[PDB]
């Protein structure tokens, strides 16, 4: 029942999921060079004169701001989360959202590129590599993570529980009631363990594999925040959205 409630909250609150992404990825407009990036912008984000890399940077920020709002509503729907001290809810979301974001982005990624703009575009991995430093260094580690993550062949029922476990993490810095959160996480992880054994009877190590992926995600996010800081202090026109500034502020 806890598993079902978490899965239903995931289906309700996230506009994109692995089934919807797989349906599309089998017709999105392909962004693979400067010309098609410009055409996609005219069609899909008509509002925006700046460098191509900074324009993509601002589209990326806007995407992340939307996903944080989806994750906040998802978290509120996790049984017990709303019983926590509000300050601890903030702390859980602050440290959890980007691990959740990069885990879920894997659902829209393949070896050649990734869905963007609510499924209406597909940006190639090579085009992103072709951008000027430091922007060409941002997505490649995320593609590397996603290739291995997708090899586990999780479905949306698995991922919903994985994301809940990421959010409900008792060892975030600055938590007031560490004990309540640890207890809440123990129940989620218990339901995830049982779910993996029923849904993936062929992979007896899937649960410890996924525990390792949450540690990999923590390190991926730490390194990503270092790129955020390199951009914020060197890039002339790369203004941070205030919500994302709040999230990155004093996080590692």
């Amino acid at each position: 029942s806890l598993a079902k409630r978490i899965y239903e909250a995931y289906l309700k609150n996230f506009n994109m999921n692995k089934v919807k992404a797989r349906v599309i990825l089998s017709p999105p407009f392909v962004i693979h060079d400067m010309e098609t990036l410009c055409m996609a912008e005219k069609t899909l984000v008509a509002k925006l004169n700046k460098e191509a890399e900074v324009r993509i940077f601002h589209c990326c920020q806007c995407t992340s701001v939307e996903t944080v709002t989806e994750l906040t509503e998802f978290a509120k729907a996790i049984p017990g989360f709303a019983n926590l001290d509000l300050n601890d809810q903030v702390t859980l979301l602050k440290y959890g959202v980007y691990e959740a974001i990069f885990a879920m982005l894997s659902s829209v990624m393949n070896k050649d590129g990734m869905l963007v703009a609510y499924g209406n575009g597909f940006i190639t991995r090579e085009f992103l590599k072709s951008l000027r430093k430091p922007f060409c260094d941002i997505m490649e580690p995320k593609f590397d993570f996603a290739m291995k993550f997708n090899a586990l062949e999780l479905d949306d029922s698995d991922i919903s529980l994985f994301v809940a476990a990421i959010i409900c993490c008792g060892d975030r810095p600055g938590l007031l009631n560490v004990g309540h959160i640890e207890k809440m996480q123990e129940g989620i992880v218990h339901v995830l363990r049982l779910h993996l054994q029923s849904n993936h009877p062929d992979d007896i190590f899937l649960f410890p594999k996924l525990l390792q992926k949450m540690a990999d995600l923590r390190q991926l996010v730490t390194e990503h925040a270092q790129l955020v800081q390199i951009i914020k202090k060197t890039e002339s026109d790369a203004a941070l959205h205030p919500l994302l500034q709040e999230i990155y502020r004093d996080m590692y």
């Binding site: 944080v68 906040t72 509120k76 509000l86 809810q89 903030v90 979301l93 205030p242 919500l243 709040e246």
Partner: peptide, 10 residues
Amino acid sequence: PSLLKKLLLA
């Protein structure tokens, strides 16, 4: 307060 706090409050 904070933008996250606002988000958590409906």
